[PDB]
Amino acid sequence: AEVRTIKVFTTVDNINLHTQVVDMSMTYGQQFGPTYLDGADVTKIKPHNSHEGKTFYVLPNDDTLRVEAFEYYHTTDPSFLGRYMSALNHTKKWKYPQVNGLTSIKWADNNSYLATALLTLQQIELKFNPPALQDAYYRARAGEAANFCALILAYCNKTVGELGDVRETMSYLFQHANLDSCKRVLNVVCQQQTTLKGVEAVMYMGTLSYEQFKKGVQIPGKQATKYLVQQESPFVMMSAPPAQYELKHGTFTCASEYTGNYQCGHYKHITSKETLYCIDGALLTKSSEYKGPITDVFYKENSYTTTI
Ligand SMILES: O=C(Nc1cccc2ccccc12)c1cccnc1
Ligand SMILES: [Cl-]
Ligand SMILES: [Cl-]
Ligand SMILES: [Cl-]
Ligand SMILES: [Cl-]
Ligand SMILES: [Zn+2]
């Protein structure tokens, strides 16, 4: 016969390249195991002349690739890279319009939760620990958000099409961020002080109102009053089961609204600027106040000490 070869590069992080000489009579799968080209699964495809010099993603199946993969992604989940490529093959087809100066996402594949989460990140002070999220988030800020969206889906174990919860998505992103400074001190009355650190310092479930949190809130044999003693964080995220709630200009940073039923609904994003903007993927509307089924509100913070 004839024995044709081309040079290609393999990678796990798209920075460190590994020279390979491949045989054009055999599948990528036969030579590398699972192989991807900008998200497309090429496992079962033979190399084409047009592939010469291109970078393919492979699985971290030896020690060089494992160390590179862990240093870049901070995960040893063996399905991670497959899940990332699968998502990226869809997210690179989404549109990321600039809406009121923020990178949003045009509705597709039930992605409203991601669009609100992405708009929220652009309004709060947060730095990611994995280089993969640092690099993708920098590009997402500049308007090329496909990698960042595909990484969020991979790190949160969501496939394209699956509706997620904004609070849970933010929770997972927060676990991969530098929130070590963050500290909350609470008191309860039936006294009992507690101290929360990192992610648990910036999140509360039960009330949307930061004001109401500082004054105190009823909770579980009769009732008890919980209130905010001290807060050290650049923001706080107040969450509750979706319920009609009134948002007013200048009283909050941003918020997520959830309409519809369990596992069949739609998020919109409200931002407080010169007035209230409702951002619904590519869609933009304004009002002086906003009433809706709110589930999350974000507030700016630095340092707070009670006067109780
Ligand atoms: O119920 C939801 N979110 C939640 C909000 C508040 C409290 C919750 C408690 C348990 C489960 C989901 C909750 C939900 C459902 C479908 C899509 N997105 C979100
Ligand atoms: Cl996917
Ligand atoms: Cl949706
Ligand atoms: Cl970052
Ligand atoms: Cl991390
Ligand atoms: Zn009691």
UniProtKB/Swiss-Prot annotation:
Active site: S112, H266, D280
Zinc fingers classed as C4-type: ranges: 190-220
Membrane topology: Multi-pass membrane protein
Effect on the protein upon substituting K226Q: In strain: Gamma/P.1
Domain Peptidase C16: 72-308
Effect on the protein upon substituting T76L: Increased cleavage of ubiquitin in vitro; no effect on ISG15 cleavage in vitro
Catalysis performed (reactions): Thiol-dependent hydrolysis of ester, thioester, amide, peptide and isopeptide bonds formed by the C-terminal Gly of ubiquitin (a 76-residue protein attached to proteins as an intracellular targeting signal)
Impact when changing A146D: In strain: Alpha/B.1.1.7
Domain of life according to the entry: Viruses
Residues reported in the UniProt entry to bind Zn(2+) 4: C190
Domain Ubiquitin-like: 3-58
Annotated phenotype, changing G250S: In strain: Omicron/EG.5.1
Regulation: Inhibited in vitro by GRL-0617.
Localisation per UniProt entry: Host endoplasmic reticulum membrane
Outcome, altering T5I: In strain: Kappa/B.1.617.1
Phenotype when changing V67A: Partial loss of ISG15 cleavage in vitro
Primary role: Responsible for the cleavages located at the N-terminus of the replicase polyprotein. Participates together with nsp4 in the assembly of virally-induced cytoplasmic double-membrane vesicles necessary for viral replication. Antagonizes innate immune induction of type I interferon by blocking the phosphorylation, dimerization and subsequent nuclear translocation of host IRF3. Also prevents host NF-kappa-B signaling. In addition, PL-PRO possesses a deubiquitinating/deISGylating activity and processes both 'Lys-48'- and 'Lys-63'-linked polyubiquitin chains from cellular substrates.
Subunit structure: May form homohexamers. Interacts with N protein.
Protein name per Swiss-Prot or TrEMBL: Papain-like protease nsp3
